[PDB]
Amino acid sequence: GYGAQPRHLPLTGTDILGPFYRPGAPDRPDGVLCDGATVELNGRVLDQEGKTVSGAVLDVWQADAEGRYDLDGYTLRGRVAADGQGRYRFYTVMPGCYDISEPDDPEPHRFRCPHVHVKVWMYTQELLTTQLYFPDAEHNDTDRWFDPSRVVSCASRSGRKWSFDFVVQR
Amino acid sequence: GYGAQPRHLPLTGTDILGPFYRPGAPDRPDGVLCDGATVELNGRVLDQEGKTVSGAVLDVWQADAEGRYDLDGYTLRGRVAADGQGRYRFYTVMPGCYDISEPDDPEPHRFRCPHVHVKVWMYTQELLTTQLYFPDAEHNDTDRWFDPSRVVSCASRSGRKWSFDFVVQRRLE
Numbered sequence: 084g085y086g087a088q089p090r091h092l093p094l095t096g097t098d099i100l101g102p103f104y105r106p107g108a109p110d111r112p113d114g115v116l117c118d119g120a121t122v123e124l125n126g127r128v129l130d131q132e133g134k135t136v137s138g139a140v141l142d143v144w145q146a147d148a149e150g151r152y153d154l155d156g157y158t159l160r161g162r163v164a165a166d167g168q169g170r171y172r173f174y175t176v177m178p179g180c181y182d183i184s185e186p187d188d189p190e191p192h193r194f195r196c197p198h199v200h201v202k203v204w205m206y207t208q209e210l211l212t213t214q215l216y217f218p219d220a221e222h223n224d225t226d227r228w229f230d231p232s233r234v235v236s237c238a239s240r241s242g243r244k245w246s247f248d249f250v251v252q253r
Numbered sequence: 254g255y256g257a258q259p260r261h262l263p264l265t266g267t268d269i270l271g272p273f274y275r276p277g278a279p280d281r282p283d284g285v286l287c288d289g290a291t292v293e294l295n296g297r298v299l300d301q302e303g304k305t306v307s308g309a310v311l312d313v314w315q316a317d318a319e320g321r322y323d324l325d326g327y328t329l330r331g332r333v334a335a336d337g338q339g340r341y342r343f344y345t346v347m348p349g350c351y352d353i354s355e356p357d358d359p360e361p362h363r364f365r366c367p368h369v370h371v372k373v374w375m376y377t378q379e380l381l382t383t384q385l386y387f388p389d390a391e392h393n394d395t396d397r398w399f400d401p402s403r404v405v406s407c408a409s410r411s412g413r414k415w416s417f418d419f420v421v422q423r424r425l426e
């Protein structure tokens with residue numbers, strides 16, 4: 084009956100795909116998205132009941148520190164498998180900001196704040212397309228899509244360990 | 254390109270089904286869930302981009318004013334079809350609170366706040382199971398599942414009209 088049921092967890096919000104998604108990113112068994120990675124993102128994938136989503140995969144892509152995406156290959160792109168308890172871990176660089184205005188647009192141009200793009204998959208089913216953001220980062224105040232509910236949590240004084248739990252609709 | 258892309262709308266949260274759902278509720282072309290209904294709920298069904306979901310169906314069930322569900326038939330249950338602009342409306346009663354304790358529990362029993370259960374469907378695809386709540390209602394403060402982001406907005410309060418916009422996750426192409 085009603086009495087036994089826990090409160091559901093709020094769903095992680097969606098976000099725009101943007102123009103830089105590329106299918107075919109390799110599975111990254113060690114979670115390393117690029118050479119020289121020093122920043123770790125970790126967390127869990129849960130459903131709305133708080134149950135772990137075993138074997139979920141994060142399909143991740145981002146810009147490099149200069150704000151450039153790899154359009155030719157899979158640097159800073161990868162598929163990261165969550166474990167049997169829904170835990171994931173991947174290693175990357177802090178993504179840089181980048182201009183999304185046309186070059187001749189008047190000043191000031193619009194710059195995106197740092198962000199990581201994530202699709203969550205369960206086998207062939209896409210459960211979520213979203214973006215993760217960072218706290219107190221340049222252009223967070225003006226970016227159209229920045230959302231405080233999708234800011235990763237700082238797990239250490241160093242700024243190299245970040246955590247975020249996904250809540251997906253099964 | 255990024256520039257013109259819209260900001261997504263937050264998804265309507267899920268909620269528990271509870272024990273009183275019944276599949277197969279009939280379509281209600283007039284949106285009337287019970288004889289004598291006095292309260293109107295209306296709104297739109299949107300996707301995460303804010304685009305309307307034409308023809309989505311709300312599969313609604315609730316308790317009557319005494320806090321009792323219909324366990325024999327389909328009173329205060331029904332399927333309500335959104336139109337081509339995603340707009341829905343249905344007519345019901347203000348649901349009552351009801352005890353979720355057994356009498357074995359001591360006299361401080363627990364009651365739910367008033368709520369309406371809703372499943373959103375597109376054809377045979379279920380998009381959402383959730384619950385809608387009311388403002389400043391009894392037991393909102395203690396109910397385990399009450400969520401202010403799913404409280405209906407008073408449209409009139411004189412016509413007893415309430416509004417809520419659903420935001421459901423769809424495949425974007």
Ligand SMILES: [Fe+3]
Binds near residue numbers: 103146198200
């Ligand atoms: Fe981007």
Ligand SMILES: [Fe+3]
Binds near residue numbers: 271273316365368370
């Ligand atoms: Fe109920």
